[PDB]
Amino acid sequence: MKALDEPPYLTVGTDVSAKYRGAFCEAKIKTAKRLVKVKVTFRHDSSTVEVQDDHIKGPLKVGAIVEVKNLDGAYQEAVINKLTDASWYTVVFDDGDEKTLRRSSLCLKGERHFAESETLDQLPLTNPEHFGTPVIGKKTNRGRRSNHIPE
Numbered sequence: 001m002k003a004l005d006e007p008p009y010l011t012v013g014t015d016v017s018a019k020y021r022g023a024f025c026e027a028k029i030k031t032a033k034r035l036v037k038v039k040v041t042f043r044h045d046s047s048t049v050e051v052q053d054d055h056i057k058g059p060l061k062v063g064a065i066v067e068v069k070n071l072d073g074a075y076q077e078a079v080i081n082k083l084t085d086a087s088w089y090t091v092v093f094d095d096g097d098e099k100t101l102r103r104s105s106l107c108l109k110g111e112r113h114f115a116e117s118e119t120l121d122q123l124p125l126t127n128p129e130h131f132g133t134p135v136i137g138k139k140t141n142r143g144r145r146s147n148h149i150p151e
């Protein structure tokens with residue numbers, strides 16, 4: 001660090017509160033995992049997504065067209081915008097689960113484990129009805145009917 005402006009830090013062996021399925025359960029850092037999360041612009045849709053380095057095949061550098069293996073099973077052409085240090089801490093829960101979560105979803109066990117819950121509340125929303133981008137009619141690849149079926 002430079003000035004060390006954040007004294008509480010998470011390290012292996014340290015017990016923290018990890019958000020498991022929505023509820024913060026106290027688990028201890030089993031290991032620290034630097035995940036490289038790559039923010040990529042999908043070339044076919046122009047949308048910026050943020051995916052794990054694991055799905056990125058090719059070279060990991062800004063401006064590079066890489067091939068993203070999506071969970072859909074499709075490789076997609078995308079451009080790397082940035083490589084993000086996603087320092088996630090892999091915590092071991094006392095039920096036997098181990099999972100890495102980002103430090104923003106981890107509260108340091110120094111008498112802090114949240115006296116709250118989100119409660120999966122669905123009233124306060126910041127995202128409106130996402131039905132797509134305005135004017136659906138700007139894509140180059142089209143192919144309805146193709147004279148194969150009267151549709």
